[PDB]
Enzyme design. Sequence first.
Site, PDB file in Angstrom:
ATOM      1  N   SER A 122     -61.119  49.598  30.160  1.00 18.90           N
ATOM      2  CA  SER A 122     -61.886  50.021  28.986  1.00 18.90           C
ATOM      3  C   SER A 122     -61.208  49.541  27.699  1.00 18.90           C
ATOM      4  CB  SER A 122     -62.131  51.539  28.948  1.00 18.90           C
ATOM      5  OG  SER A 122     -60.914  52.225  28.685  1.00 18.90           O
TER       6      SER A 122
ATOM      7  N   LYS B 229     -57.172  61.099  26.333  1.00 18.85           N
ATOM      8  CA  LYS B 229     -57.702  62.398  26.731  1.00 18.85           C
ATOM      9  C   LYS B 229     -56.657  63.522  26.566  1.00 18.85           C
ATOM     10  CE  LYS B 229     -62.051  61.283  28.066  1.00 18.85           C
ATOM     11  NZ  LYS B 229     -61.906  59.868  28.410  1.00 18.85           N
TER      12      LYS B 229
END
Lengths: 303, 303, 7, 7
Positions: free
Chosen positions: A272, A42
Amino acid sequence: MAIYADNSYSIGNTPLVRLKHFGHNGNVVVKIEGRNPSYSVKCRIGANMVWQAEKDGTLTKGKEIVDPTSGNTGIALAYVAAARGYKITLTMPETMSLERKRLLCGLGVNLVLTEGAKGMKGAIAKAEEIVASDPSRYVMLKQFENPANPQIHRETTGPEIWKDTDGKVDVVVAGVGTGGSITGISRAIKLDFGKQITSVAVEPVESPVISQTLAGEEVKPGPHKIQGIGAGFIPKNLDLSIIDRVETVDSDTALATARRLMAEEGILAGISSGAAVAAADRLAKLPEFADKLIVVILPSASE
Amino acid sequence: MAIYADNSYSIGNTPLVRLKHFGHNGNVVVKIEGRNPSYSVKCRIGANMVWQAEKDGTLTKGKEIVDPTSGNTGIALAYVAAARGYKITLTMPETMSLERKRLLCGLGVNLVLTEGAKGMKGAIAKAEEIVASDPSRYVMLKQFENPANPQIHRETTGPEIWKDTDGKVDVVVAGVGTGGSITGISRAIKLDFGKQITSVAVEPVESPVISQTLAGEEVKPGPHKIQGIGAGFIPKNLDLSIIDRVETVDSDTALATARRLMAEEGILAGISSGAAVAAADRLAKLPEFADKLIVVILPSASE
Amino acid sequence: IGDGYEF
Amino acid sequence: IGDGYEF
């Protein structure tokens, strides 16, 4: 030559590492996005979304960022805001971890906590309320729909993979949250570099909205524990046209895979990352994918 | 071309970022060793100390690593051991954090806890006891004295700094724990690249054993909170001959500096990164160092 | 990311 | 590192 003006420009150039205890004959290779400012992928969209808002005049000296995010995007935006000198408010359910709160506060964020029970809906509602109060003052960057999101992946993430594989990548496996990663990477490799790879989106079996959508079945989102993926809707930053395959992974498999990455590979990745590897490992052990170089995004690190 | 055989080879190539709210006219630049496998500079010596032991035949298939470390070295050795398939035991005072314990256990370490009250002496004693029991089985890598420690800094850390500054670095500021960093960097720049820079060692004012030693005064170690520096002795891996200057920093200044790196620079560094920056900032604001490019090692990240 | 929804 | 001594 190589001194960054601020920490936002230090994004990316993350390593590719071959897995020993997954895939077949070393066909599974991972890109460690944990090796970034703020410890996740991110950082790239936090950087670019700010840069783009500056270029297009929507973000100026003085104006303040406001965003609903309970995850890595908040940390990413905070670090960039700190590096480039922006005030920032982040709304989020009050149920957020003390760790995460302390880290955000430490980065100089104005943290606005919402009703836990109302979840993200609560947080988004409040974010919109704040912006309504002075629209000339506040800017909402909107990770789920902002083109600057997949754009950074097209310019950096995808090219890094092309580069480090000597154009030999055959499959890209990425979990979908905003969809920016898989979309950006895919456009870069398929359209910019002209290679017809297999783009594999990964989502929780507990909330398999991409699989349901594409199958024409009733879309039924659900809870899961794979932090970073399974938004429970199709985001505008997922380009369905560039997705060749959708793989579903369960929370428990995802978890155990992350623990195996740590104990057997010495790679400190998030849940993830576990989900992405489990999916890739499954493709890697199909004869169809035996001679294929499969590249797996690991979106974040584990502390 | 750029796919690592395992996570140990992914070490280094860490970024240089210019500070805005320290130094003068951008003369302070930091190298972020937090951007590494296992999140610190120790990843480099964990890697090289294993590699060297393999090359010289002291570490083979089968044999097991044993080491007393209550810090980043343990994490580094664990990740490398995991990546390269070695059993590893780490001894440490029982007073270690649950976080750290869980992380080490997760990496597959055999954790042997010692009496808290006995501190590191306790841990080192037990490590030696374990090795005594089967010397053909166990290997102790010895971060404080192993030449592979400064050797990796000479081959990687120092050259990265030369490279990214276009040979323009004038001062290197590094906290001393093992001393590997400052020694390695210094030998590389002074001896390999031939530049007479200023090498500045940084230590706690609370335990200023390098300053005392070089001044010929009684060496009096003490406790402090700057994790990673202030061993309370001169390690064999600190080459005093290459040290031009020694700066002392206090725990509280070091802490506040780290918080400022986070809030004002958006840079997530540890307390010892704070200590290094405070020292550099002080040099940076002396007229002597005004036209000098000062490079500061930030040894680790903050979670 | 954190809770687009659920998680 | 962690406690060469003290810390």
